[PDB]
Design a protein around this nucleic acid. Structure first.
Ligand SMILES: [Br-]
Lengths: 15, 18
RNA sequence: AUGCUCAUGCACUGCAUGAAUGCCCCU
RNA sequence: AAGGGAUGC
């Protein structure tokens, strides 16, 4: 659904 | 580029993980 | 498009909370 | 995209 600290954090290290 | 689904064991392990 | 996934909380829907063991082996 | 394993000595 919406971004979360966890998913966001993942996206970062993941980016 | 991969995901991995948390299972009953993985989660159980983590639950016990302090 | 992790803008997920998956648990737990009196519809494969909400809400809230937590987990990168969300591993590693295998079939 | 499905299943199993803590003897995962
Ligand atoms: Br295998």
């Amino acid at each position: 659904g919406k971004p979360t600290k966890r998913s966001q954090n993942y996206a970062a290290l993941r980016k």
